From TrEMBL, chains A, B:
Alphabetical list of SUPFAM superfamilies matching this protein: alpha/beta-Hydrolases
Active site per the UniProt annotation: 101, 250
Gene Ontology terms, MF aspect: hydrolase activity
Protein encoded by which gene: cumD
The name this protein goes by in its record: 2-hydroxy-6-oxo-7-methylocta-2,4-dienoate hydrolase
């Protein structure tokens, strides 16, 4: 299973992660869909970025193959603590961070609590602001296992549905039913789910204080997190750039891979 | 005067233009401020793009050093005819087009009337949709010569006012009072100016038919053409990408030169 990589103790949690490349560190933080893992999210991103940067992609506690501590208290702050724990464990003093959706909210929160540890940020279809729950997100977080339910989620995630094959639905369904995965997932974002969008968000006041050069990316057709959310982040973050891809959903790094990789690499190269 | 380049008869009008580089043709169309010229708009763009493309930057009839025919009837269609005339004169069968503001509206109109002559388009703080006249635009089109009036326009065009020096104001003021310049400019967009924004615009219905890969660029702080206009173009054009630069005004190619050039070159390289 290529989703399983290296192991390291971070913030007291045995953590699964990938570490490829040399030089300036870049932390990639995955999203929050069922069966998600750092590899599943970043498999096409790591190869491109690792040619010029040291890329670290961990499975956040509660997701992927990282340990799921009994009675663990999941929260925005706890996840930030995990990210910082991972950085501390790897002697990563300052790094750029690429946050995908759920991970984008964590990236913002990390930059706010540990400004000295974060350089540039890339926020993709990111959490971070209070937006009204979408049917797409409610379906994603309300997932129950089945190939048809996963097919629907895959359709919700991408613009080009022709990319959603029976094989892909089958493989992701299998990923979602791995030991303890659905158990922790279904209890992670219970109804009413608006509470979790709000919990993952940072206040307008706090976001305005971010001094980091930031690249906000969004797919025009994103059915999970509305484009309006990234427009708002763009109004709040001073040193920001927004890049919206037409004919693109909530899976930008996979749907517009080459464009995405070029944009991100050049953005970091600027530093 | 570096603003004066080569001369060629196009659409029956003696036209001033710049032609640098080899390969795939790219037509750069300037904006509509007082004293504007292709060189003034594109002096920092041509060098970068001409390394990989054949860059053609003409002074549109009624602007710069191109002839200003007596009793010439200026209109969106007439300007499109000039662009096509320039392309015909240079045996440019198909080209990419970069349109800045006023030029962006012309680019859209050219792609609609001569779809087979236009490949990819870059629209910067572009005209093309009906937006409510801004005080910035009314000031720009309502310009009367004076170093103070030009200083104000320069302030309106850029985000970083520290870039507006007495020397720059002096030089652009001088450009605006060249023989026949102010005469043709003041009679070009007379009050009520909303009429001209509307005349330069293309209908939602027509814009939706554009098959061209398009890159829409805008400065968050643009005081002349509102960001909302480019957001609308992004909703209408199917194969579009939008890149918004924070801390940037209506002079993107000059304010964020390196970022702009990189984005545009890679965008065309994709073709």
């Amino acid at each position: 299973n290529l989703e399983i990589g290296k192991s390291i103790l971070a913030a007291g949690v045995l953590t699964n992660y990938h570490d490829v490349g040399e030089g300036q560190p870049v932390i990639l933080i995955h999203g929050s869909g069922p069966g998600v893992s750092a590899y599943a999210n970043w498999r096409l991103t790591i190869p491109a970025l690792s040619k010029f940067y040291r890329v670290i992609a961990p499975d956040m506690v509660g997701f992927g193959f990282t340990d799921r501590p009994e009675n663990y208290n999941y929260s925005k702050d706890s996840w930030v603590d995990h990210i910082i724990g991972i950085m501390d464990a790897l002697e990563i003093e300052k790094a750029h961070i690429v946050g995908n959706a759920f991970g984008g909210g964590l990236a913002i929160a990390t930059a706010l609590r540990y400004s000295e540890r974060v350089d540039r940020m890339v926020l993709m279809g990111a959490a971070g602001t209070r937006f009204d729950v979408t049917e797409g997100l409610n379906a994603v977080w309300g997932y129950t296992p089945s190939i048809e339910n996963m097919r629907n989620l895959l359709d919700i995630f991408a613009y080009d549905r022709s990319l959603v094959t029976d094989e892909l639905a089958r493989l992701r369904y299998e990923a979602s039913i791995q030991p303890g995965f659905q158990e922790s997932f279904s209890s992670m974002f219970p109804e009413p789910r608006q509470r979790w969008i709000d919990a993952l968000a940072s206040s307008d006041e706090d976001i305005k204080t971010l001094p980091n050069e930031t690249l906000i990316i969004h797919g025009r057709e994103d059915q999970v997190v509305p484009l309006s959310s990234s427009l708002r982040l763009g109004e709040l973050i001073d040193r920001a750039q927004l890049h919206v891809f037409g004919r693109c959903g909530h899976w930008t790094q996979i749907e517009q891979t080459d464009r995405f990789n070029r944009l991100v690499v050049e953005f970091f190269n600027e530093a």
